[model samples]
Target chain A: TEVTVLEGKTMGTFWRASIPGIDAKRSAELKEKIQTQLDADDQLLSTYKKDSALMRFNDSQSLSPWPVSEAMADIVTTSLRIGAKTDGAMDITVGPLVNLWGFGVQIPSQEQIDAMKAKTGLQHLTVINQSHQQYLQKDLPDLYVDLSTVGEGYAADHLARLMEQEGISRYLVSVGGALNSRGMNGEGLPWRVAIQKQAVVDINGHGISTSGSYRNYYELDGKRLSHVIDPQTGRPIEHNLVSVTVIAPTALEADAWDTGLMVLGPEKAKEVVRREGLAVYMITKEGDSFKTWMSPQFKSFLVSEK
Target chain B: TEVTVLEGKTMGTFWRASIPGIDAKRSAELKEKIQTQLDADDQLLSTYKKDSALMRFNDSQSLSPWPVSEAMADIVTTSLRIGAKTDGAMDITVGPLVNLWGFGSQEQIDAMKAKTGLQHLTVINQSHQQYLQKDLPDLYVDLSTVGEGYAADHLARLMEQEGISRYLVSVGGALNSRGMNGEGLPWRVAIQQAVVDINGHGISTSGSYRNYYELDGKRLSHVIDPQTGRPIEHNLVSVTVIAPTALEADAWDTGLMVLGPEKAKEVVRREGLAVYMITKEGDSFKTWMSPQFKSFLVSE
Candidate 1:
């Protein structure tokens, strides 16, 4: 009943790995390998990194197709596809709007917000695949592609793939708040993941991600402003949905959907969940208390709650 | 805690509805309304009926855009979208290929598959009007892939429209449940080795194990792949998909069944589809469940 735990810092947040069975030497070796893989992904996806692949694309002013790695192209494709499904609620092209709203740095004028809105939309971004080469094309010069929302989830999924490749099937991996686990824990039971102290779900080869505006927001003029930007409104979301936790087969999807669904608020989010057959749990603000809602498919994951 | 049940025939199969608290008179009224709604959908989408909306589109030899009802356009759009997701595994345009497999009355042939593909179909969904166009004159649009799912969803909506919230609706083998069952738990459904509580969700199971036959030393399934224009050759026995609506699950189930285990798993992970699959393994069978599907698993 031995377990190995690894922890590190990445993307301005902490990452953790739990392994059911592995020697100390192998664990140390894996720690280095996993860290290296994550660091590489961070370099490719981080918006904060000036030289990252995504930032470079954002900095470019060309309208022609720009070559990118297959991984990058695939991520963009997934983001666009989900954007369509959610009715543009989950937009990777909303980076300009995010920056204008000061989530990236400083608040802008009314005119800036209006202009940024014109530059954002999944419709303006296209992924081109030709002869095994992948390219990302932008219809506008100022269009920015942000992977920050789904990057941690993608990193977690990458770690899972790495684990499978290393022949280690039983492990729990998380980058920032995005998590994915497989096989069994040391006690020979499903991996137990706790969500905001509200409920615990047993995880086995599944990814779980929770998105909330409570942690990353600032107050302006005595009004609370959440950091989750609604792409449609071009401003921070003002809604009753405080938190959303999504379960998917991959961390990438769970992460993307958690943010998208949260921005959609309670009613619309629930409708999208039902339409897309998403497994999600949400906490919405009520008149003096909190109301919790979970999709029908998500009910089986509730092990215990507070 | 009183349970009321309603049953009717549609799409060449029986459909059943179960609810907990409607009075006898109201229940009878609801039954008639439900039957009327089901019949309307059949009229719009049934391929067996020569004059059905879908059959008329299939029977036409013209490659021009054809006017269609909103429901017809929606179903065809869904079928095409899922066909892309499963890489042409759930093709509704494979009607010709289905006929070529000896499942229909047409003589079996190898070249019929070339006429099948979702790519040849164009759907224009405008708020005011919707229409469909086929690039290939021989392209035939079939609704079998989503018939039961669409019917279940339509019935579930009909119940809500009738002021009934808590109910379970099943069309053929596809089902959609809303609110809770008579026991106040989620509506429990039995699919192969698992009995799952489908909490207001839709579930569909598609498999080649039941509907297949050995022809010329090759086992052929009724499920045909529009990409290859032939029966699927894989060890996958069955796949059950859970979605927000029965139609989505129905399309995914059929698509995944045609994609087999490996490719199907890839699509499931990418789309975060909730699915459970059983694959033939030598003399026995092995089961696989997507992480999303596992979240809905109840204790044994």
Candidate 2:
């Protein structure tokens, strides 16, 4: 038995797996399998691909419910549930707003931005389950879903399932920066991961996702606007909260919450995280420095004493 | 954190994943991902698809080196290596012989059997490109024997990449298990009448009982003996091989099954491979085990 590490690309990001007590030959074979699985998944959920399932759904003009695979329905259903939980802070139908803000092509004028807002809302999206078949229908014809916020987490969670199936009881799996960890490493120690420049935590048997305005942002009229737009405002988020990190039982949940909580800002996010009993770590911008907040449940995972 | 179990379809069979500390949301996403991966793999390797990667290659008349993906190259390379290890008993180029048996569209004939041989095929790797070529245009590659094990191995690697530290992944009867279950005990797998504890290893069972057809009241097994270009004629009912990976176990199981009890035991001893065999003996059955086979056994 030996410890091995494998890495590949998935969901516009890199993915990695570490296993204990498996030979190199077996590890190499597994790496190919993982890359194939990830590539298949990218084709399913990608909005960039014109032939992707999401893009086809986006391109449809029919008002009737459109059929989708179980996976697609499940993802849409979860997104809707999370959308409600965050009080519409996180909307998959925010695609029009995303484009209007020039996150894709051209920036919109004042009137254009306001008009795109009307087309954006979680309420416009509905996942219907009928006679063992699932479908996705849009109340508004132009409604589009952009899974970029939670796609990495979905990929990470998907990779975690692949790991558990392989009978590797101890390992760490990551897609892009989103992470899912289980058991112990080869050294019989808990897996430790960093949130870069801020804090570190034990993520064993847990999922972690971070959303921030630190990297993806734009400048307009001397005001900095984050690419993470608040759906309610129909514009890029305007707040002192710079970053939000969320840990949950699954990467998808963690991924969804990070975006929603980030849009909620530090004060409202604190209220929600505490009320929901979530393990979270938050970073907010101050006058000259950044202030950090960790939920009580998050203390157990911290490497340093709070 | 809670333990979650996810199951899906793959390789003309079902596959399962047992994970600890993952939620329903993640499990659902992973289930879709696993199914999609398996479906794509099936499309790549399944001979049933006329347009699949493997079938297109098979349909091609190109004697020139044909480029293949890393997955395809890895599987073919492993198949050829195992073919050599088994002394051509488990040959992928044995397709023409199999088809000649009337199992496929082609009618059973001796001349068609003559066209089949592992020696005609070559796998080449130059830089990042992997290629497969055949000396004879009629030499067909059929990977049904080892494809399941390869699929299982691939699933194991996918899990490790996802950071799942312990798992039991299976495609058909071929399986690779690692670490322990949610109960913190080594994975207990049931094979035939015995339950064995397996850790970080792959196990495959090859038997003549499941797939067979009757001609003139005589039962013929689906497993064609590559060397003889005919179905095996033996008292051996089953062969189970355990190895470091499912690909090895899958190929060895079929190869040993083709060799019969006598020749299989000899090869197992010479190669020091762990194997267990069941042979029909009139009213009952007899069991044989290699010397290294018992190391994986656990008492009930």
Candidate 3:
């Protein structure tokens, strides 16, 4: 009976794992296997690597169907499905606007925003699965698909699969803000993680993710600009919703939904959460203090609610 | 003044690292980092994984220039270079032959032989990205022989990132060491009774002792010949090589082991390599070493 902890870097963030009944010998081998799996996931999805699978597609201006890995196709398919559900709030094709406002290129003009918008949409891209081969096609050539939003969730889910393949039954694994857990901790109690700094959830056999607009932002000419750009507006989201967390069957699903809900703001986010029956927790900023809310489904996983 | 031991697995084998003056927190983090790095290395090279970078290339039918990572290119480049120097003994594109015989009749072996050889594969390095192109779509590239060495060397680079100046790290039989031990001594390695300090160098050993099966009352080795498309039946028991990097040492060991003692010694002398060999002769074993190998022996 043991709880062994392992940590490393992936997807521009650190990943961690806690496995019970593991000694140095098993841990060493498991650690190597976990890292290699994450690296392959990163190499498949990274936008920074000029030679990455995603980048190769991004850099290419081909209107024809391009061959892609099964992993790549899965992520894009999930992203698009969630994007439509959120009414384009979870758009992966909004990379151009993300890069535009991301660099703070002197507050892009209406026409400048229009040009980038014409190249972006949830309807422009398609993923095909013919027999054993998968391909991604973009009618718009510069259709930059950035999966950085769902990367951690996809990676965390991948970790869970790796654990299952290795015959690891009790474990808690995380990639950045996305996580998955099952069984119990060293104390033999349920594995727990904090939702923000207060409430705790067991989240056993499910994946959880939190998206916050408070962290990634830059001050452009004395104006605070958030990194999350609304696809419809082609501008950074200016909303009171600061954070949104979602728990789903898979971390990849949780990650995309969290972003999609965050972009919808509190009022609209609540509507979607209620409609879809998703376990969601949200934090909003209003007039000097913060307010929190959670769905009844989310309340089911909470061990400690403050 | 402390020695910390870290162990993990990669390339279908275990890896060990001994670093001086590291605590639990750093060791935990380093262990995680090392494992992850090695895992990525395995994903890039493993012939066993159907989705690995190498496998993806092998499975693809398109002969179009396929984009590959720089690490993949480097591994292929070094392997291709040594493969040529060994005069085709260290062929990376010999996967078809290795697979068939590992699974062959002489007719089957000869039929599969047409799908292999080093020339059919090419590695092209460019401005930022690297490309791997195959003339024959079925040409399979196997990095199993050189993977451990490359991974061991990658670990050495990772150690540098952690500012660890004194350490001994290895993946399987390939080792890369640069610093002293916790007892304030050089990192000594024992190779066939010739214990030596292998600091700032990489070492690897390839042998025919294990991984074999009886075929028609004849013992067949796992190591295959790319030229004849057959298992090698030589008395060259084992060979250990030390080089500037573990990648080369690992590559050379396999090539030389396939060459047997006489040709292996010739290549060793021709390349001015630091090498040691053990050969079997009529129920007795004999040992030999290159003159360059004697320079590394630790004698007090």
Candidate 4:
């Protein structure tokens, strides 16, 4: 078929419409908007923007007490809700732990790691607003928030909406790799996206992988570090399930759900998708060849890779 | 507990503020816009709204002629990338088998299950298109594209971008859960909304739940229906997890990097938040639960 492909990555691989009318401009426009929405400076979603907000709040301490923006409040709430739902498997308050893990120029030394461990009680981070105006519990004063992934998903969600309103019948918006696709293009076909599998090393010197096991670990410091982070223990996911592909309506939610399943690991992930009635493709790591363990939706895509 | 809780669902949840000169008309207009946005038609989604988008295409044909929308196409690409990175645990073309179990719709038949299981290799049946730089030998279609869990999250994402400031901002603003600032409005958020996919991440489900497809005298159904035309259902129990992104959640939900015990936990730590579900040792049926799900359990 005649398909135009502008490929990129985020929560998953991204491919925009390549129809004649849909060219680099449209592609670039969509990409720009997506990036803007997911950008840390997207004032609208500044809540998940984190650092800036903290700096803003700290700087403007006298500015009418500056109530939290609804978006920010919502993000905190969502994180908390996710925290409650998973009994903290997904903690919004893992800011301290995550910051300690290092991002944004702030790496933690062994001493720092141990000190922050006490504040790991992400459960203690209270978010209240007595009357719905946005409130926070008096933590040890240093509890932080990390919404990097969630913020990207939220931005992608916004870009998708903008595309919908612009009357651009068919479009796909991607930020970094987090993505969101909408409508069909001039051509009558569902857009095709790709999922990637990479390997990394965790703090424990384990060869954790983003894809499942059986794929070569390549001996990295003894342990592996998968991109899938477990909030409960604060580290990468190490699973035998080599890779997973998920099909969903939007990129943001799809990204979130994919992260959830990855953290759940293979066995639990399988059962969760099954009960919830999800469409999925899974590959199991079995030494080297890799075994396939997929949801009913993925069976059709199975092909023997050389 | 300086909380002023609202009481009720959907219609009962409301938040309003007045600045006197803020123009009541403009406020009303804004409310309409928000409501219109929140209660957006299924067609608001470019792919689903149209007659032949990726999502709609998947709805119509589960085999061969993949009539997907740009949105659906976007999702497919996203999944494909995830599959490449994660090694095939994330594939968008898994719909054929997904449909057999009926998570996307309320309809999944036995014959369809059997056909989906044994004949997935024959790509001539599905209506969705399949573009190949190489050969994608076998592929299927399903509706995990947009589901309840994901639908809720995507909507929450939208509400934030709209800049709806007068209410609580936890996802959709403190609708009925009571104003987080003690404004006294209860937060009564809706659990359902149109499932939308802006990028490739959104809500969806996977399962082997139906009376379709039989093997011998045993009638088995669960989420383990293999999507590869081979019916080797797994022993995993049902699991539901909520995360920052549905795409990630959906990929993981399908058993990303399928690791047993030790490795699985490591992945979770690396990726942030995710939950799991597994059948108890003695249970014949699958179970459902997640850290995210548990936290949101009946807060009222």
Highest lDDT among the candidates is held by which one? 3
Higher-scoring candidate on TM-score, 1 or 3 = 1
The global Cα lDDT (0 to 1) of model 3 is 0.79
lDDT of 1: 0.77
Q: Which interface RMSD values do the candidates have, in the order shown?
A: 10.8, 18.5, 20.6, 26.2
Task: Report how far residue A197 has shifted in candidate 1, in Å.
Answer: 6.2
Compose the digit string of candidate 3's lDDT tens values, residues B192-228. Answer: 5468666656899986455434445354577777877
Residues A1-306 of candidate 3 have per-residue lDDT tens digits of: 579999999878999999988989999999899999999988999888878989999999999889887577768877886887787799888888877775423656567888889988878877654323457878888788889999999999888767645656568999999998766589857677888837798676567999977743321234365767899998778987889999865789999999999998999999888776688998887655678898877875676443
- Ranked by DockQ, top first: 1, 4, 2, 3
TM-score leader: 1
Arrange candidates by TM-score, descending: 1, 2, 3, 4
Which wins on DockQ, candidate 1 or candidate 2? Answer: 1
lDDT of 2 by residue, A1-306 (tens): 356889877776788888777787888888988898888789988887989988998999888978887567657766776777787787788888777777635644587878878887776776543223456878788878888788888888877656544544467888886888765577756566888444678766568888877643311234454677788888767777877788765688889888888888887888887666687887776655567787766765676553
Indicate the worst ten consecutive residues by lDDT in candidate 2 chain B: B210-219
Per candidate, native contacts kept equal: 0.00, 0.00, 0.00, 0.02
Say which docking band candidate 2 falls in: incorrect
How high is the lDDT of residue B109 in model 4?
A: 39
